[PDB]
Write a protein that binds this ligand. Structure first.
Ligand SMILES: NCCCCCC(=O)O
Length: 85
């Protein structure tokens, strides 16, 4: 069965487990506020699937999923999620 290996379009419905940015940084967890404080709180929009530190696209960015990063000097970065054929 399908296991979230790719995203449809820009990934508003992506629910896979990639947790590293394009440059290879580990993502910050959505339920954490350090190193970056933010307002993408999982409980505020459960259907946005903001789980663990997985790359997601909760602001409908046309470039696709991203995460806050664990680098204290890089707030966020896109991830490399392949688009489904
Ligand atoms: N469009 C991807 C980055 C969105 C970052 C929003 C923020 O700084 O809280």
């Amino acid at each position: 069965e399908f296991s979230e290996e790719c995203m449809h379009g820009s990934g508003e419905n992506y629910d896979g487990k990639i947790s590293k940015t394009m440059s290879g940084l580990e993502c910050q967890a959505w339920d954490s506020q350090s190193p970056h404080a933010h307002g993408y709180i999982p409980s505020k929009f459960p259907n946005k699937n903001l789980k663990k530190n997985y790359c997601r696209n909760p602001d409908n960015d046309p470039q696709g999923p991203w995460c806050f990063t664990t680098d204290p000097n890089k707030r966020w970065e896109y991830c490399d999620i392949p688009r489904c054929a």
